[PDB]
Write a protein that binds this ligand. Structure first.
Ligand SMILES: CC(=O)N[C@@H]1[C@@H](O)[C@H](O)[C@@H](CO)O[C@H]1O
Ligand SMILES: *[C@@H]1O[C@H](CO)[C@@H](O)[C@H](O)[C@H]1NC(C)=O
Ligand SMILES: *[C@@H]1O[C@H](CO)[C@@H](O)[C@H](O)[C@H]1NC(C)=O
Ligand SMILES: *[C@@H]1O[C@H](CO)[C@@H](O)[C@H](O)[C@H]1NC(C)=O
Ligand SMILES: *[C@@H]1O[C@H](CO)[C@@H](O)[C@H](O)[C@H]1NC(C)=O
Ligand SMILES: *[C@@H]1O[C@H](CO)[C@@H](O)[C@H](O)[C@H]1NC(C)=O
Lengths: 145, 88, 175, 231
């Protein structure tokens, strides 16, 4: 039941002799040649520079916190930026960051010591994590140093 | 954007299979979908360039076979119902 | 568990090719830099190459520069070393080491079990040092202003026949 | 403390004949009679006729607004306010509507004159928009405010009219104007008016109708605009 149009008739009628007439053997449908995912051109890019490219950061004890919403943010540009030496994402994966949506983002900006950057991971202890800026172990975010 | 091809379009959250053709439907400046009495998506506004496209379901239908008696002859003609001549 | 399995090691011939693949689970593999490190049978560790969190920046040892390609597929969270135009000096055991921190303060904490591939050191650390129980032994690394002075010094203790283990990172701390 | 001029005035009522119909969705329909169940203003309903008078009003299931020299500037949607809870405040001083769901400190007296003293300051803002201006009597501006799924959507239409009292006859569908992902609950609101104690007032009437889960039948014409409706 796959080589001849006649054979499909023999197969639908379940007979080896097909009487004269017209027989609706099967159905066809032109298949999607491809997929066209289309969205409106980006209109509300987020200003990461306001927090990242800021000319004056804040002390770690008085760390700045900037709310990000009413906006679209491309975290792939940050992740694929050579300026950042550390991009540690906890609770999420950076490759899927553009895939997900959140109610709001908080950019917590401060300045610490190099030996001290490893204190901005969930569950870490010391003098920055315990005393200056603590991240919960149930952390859904990223750290960019 | 590709027109005149059966595609799996995903205009915003609205997904569907069909062929996209430029049209003259005058969507109001706020309208995105188009619909008919059957409550089926008929037209869509292209999100990133403000244009109106109709979603014609891709050529589909029954495949009837016209055959004389098998004892008479083995020759066969094929009738693709309600479809233009596309693939032979 | 932050274990990193690794495979792709076996008998090959000089001038050929070999794909080593190590899969990391238990952590965000796409956020931590990783590297391939090499240990010749009965010889000190030789760091093959290293790839960043994004896979954009790749670093290679000049002994293997221009013939090994380090690659990283974050979707399957696996990481590959493509060894091409191999030499006789490359017969060793390979590990892929997770990098705790950014470069330059590299810190290799978790290491693969070891893939046996069959086909000079900048830091003039002493060949050996003899100690006694209850003694206070100081085994001293040595480097230039680019090796020791500017970047963190990390100490690994490799037991006989096992993967290395981090002891000291950032010049002072312990895991 | 409120304005020094709070004369007693009963909440006069009028009849919204066919007003309050808005495109329930962004769908285009041509020569179609669509029967949708949604929150509309009932036909021939008793809508309150406020006239300088803006007493607080409930926002139970979204409310229709009918405003007939740009005297109204916006509205103050709140639940507890008093710097206790965030609230929606819209201000159109001069062709400049601004949307702020902030922890405002608005004093019950939205003093204004140009002079602005509606709220001392806004802190803890979550959404800020600077979109293009949304806004006998000459212009009638009808609005519909609604809260579905946290989303706050404003349908609106500005119509050149000739009238002095009540709402004009005829039919005009309220085109969607802007949707705000506020995501917060709201139950009460206010209004904002241009008119430091002996301040006069200007001629301005605004009518408040209340949306209800009604079933309507919209007559989309050939061009897709809703030309007629029967509830
Ligand atoms: C709907 C459509 O465009 N398909 C065409 C139709 O216009 C034409 O009339 C027919 C032959 O008569 O062939 C097919
Ligand atoms: C900061 O400035 C640099 C200048 O090259 C630019 O490339 C980068 O995108 C900026 N980053 C942000 C977050 O604005
Ligand atoms: C959106 O981008 C497209 C492609 O560049 C352009 O043709 C169109 O004019 C843009 N429209 C807007 C919303 O600016
Ligand atoms: C509205 O209520 C007032 C006061 O009871 C009444 O006089 C008027 O007839 C009512 N109008 C409508 C539209 O029902
Ligand atoms: C700010 O407003 C938000 C609105 O949801 C509220 O939850 C929060 O408690 C307020 N306080 C601060 C300072 O965020
Ligand atoms: C649609 O708009 C056209 C002008 O473009 C107008 O002539 C026509 O009357 C409108 N629709 C109706 C009511 O037929």
């Amino acid at each position: 039941c796959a080589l001849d149009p006649l054979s499909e008739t023999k197969c639908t009628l379940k007979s080896f002799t097909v009487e004269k007439g017209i027989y609706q053997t099967s159905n066809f449908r032109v298949q999607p040649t491809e997929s066209i995912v289309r969205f409106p051109n980006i209109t509300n890019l987020c200003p990461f520079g306001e927090v990242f490219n800021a000319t004056r950061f804040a002390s770690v004890y008085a760390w700045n916190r900037k709310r990000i919403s009413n906006c679209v943010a491309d975290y792939s540009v940050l992740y694929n930026s050579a300026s950042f030496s550390t991009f540690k994402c906890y609770g999420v994966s950076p490759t899927k960051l553009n895939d997900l949506c959140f109610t709001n983002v908080y950019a917590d900006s401060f300045v610490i010591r190099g030996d001290e950057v490893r204190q901005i991971a969930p569950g870490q202890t010391g003098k920055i994590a315990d005393y200056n800026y603590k991240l919960p172990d149930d952390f859904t975010g990223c750290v960019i140093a | 954007l590709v027109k005149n091809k059966c595609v799996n379009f995903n205009f915003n959250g609205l997904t569907g299979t069909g062929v996209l053709t430029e049209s003259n439907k005058k969507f109001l400046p706020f309208q995105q979908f188009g619909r008919d009495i059957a409550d089926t998506t008929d037209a869509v506004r292209d999100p990133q360039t403000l244009e109106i496209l109709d979603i014609t379901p891709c050529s589909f239908g029954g495949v009837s076979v016209i055959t004389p008696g098998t004892n008479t002859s083995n020759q066969v003609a094929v009738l693709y119902q309600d479809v233009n001549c596309t693939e032979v | 568990e932050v274990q990193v399995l690794e495979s792709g090691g076996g008998l090959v011939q000089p001038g050929g090719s070999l794909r080593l693949s190590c899969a990391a689970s238990g952590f965000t593999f796409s956020s931590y830099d990783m590297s391939w490190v090499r240990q010749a049978p009965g010889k000190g560790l030789e760091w093959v190459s290293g790839i960043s969190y994004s896979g954009g920046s790749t670093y290679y040892a000049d002994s293997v520069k221009g013939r090994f390609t380090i690659s990283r597929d974050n979707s399957k969270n696996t990481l590959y070393l493509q060894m091409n135009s191999l030499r006789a000096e490359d017969t060793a055991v390979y590990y892929c080491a997770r990098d705790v921190n950014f470069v330059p303060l590299v810190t290799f904490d978790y290491w693969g079990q070891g893939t046996l591939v069959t086909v000079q050191s900048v830091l003039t650390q002493p060949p050996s040092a003899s100690g006694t129980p209850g003694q206070r032994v100081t085994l001293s690394c040595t480097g230039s202003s680019s090796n020791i002075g500017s970047n963190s010094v990390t100490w690994y203790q490799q037991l006989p026949g096992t993967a290395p283990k981090l002891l000291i990172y950032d010049d002072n701390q312990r895991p | 403390v409120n304005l020094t001029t709070r004369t007693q005035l009963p909440p006069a009522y009028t009849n919204s004949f066919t007003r309050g119909v808005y495109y329930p969705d962004k769908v285009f329909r041509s020569s179609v009679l669509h029967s949708t169940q949604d929150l509309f203003l009932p036909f021939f309903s008793n809508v309150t006729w406020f006239h300088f008078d803006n007493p607080v009003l409930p926002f139970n299931d979204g409310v229709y607004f009918a405003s007939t020299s740009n005297i109204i500037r916006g509205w103050i949607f709140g639940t507890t306010l008093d710097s206790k809870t965030q609230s929606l405040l819209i201000v159109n001083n001069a062709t400049n509507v601004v949307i702020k769901v902030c922890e405002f400190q608005f004093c019950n007296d939205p003093f204004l004159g140009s002079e602005f003293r509606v709220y001392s300051s806004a802190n803890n803002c979550t959404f800020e928009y600077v979109s293009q201006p949304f806004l006998n009597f000459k212009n009638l501006r009808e609005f519909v405010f609604k809260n579905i799924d946290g989303y706050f959507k404003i349908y609106s239409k500005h119509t050149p009219i000739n009238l002095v009292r009540d709402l004009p006859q005829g039919f005009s569908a309220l085109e969607p104007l802007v949707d705000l992902p506020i995501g917060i609950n709201i139950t009460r609101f206010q209004t904002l008016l241009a008119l430091s104690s002996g301040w006069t007032a200007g001629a301005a009437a605004y009518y408040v109708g209340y949306l209800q889960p009604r079933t309507f039948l919209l007559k989309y014409n050939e061009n897709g605009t809703i030309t007629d409706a029967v509830d």
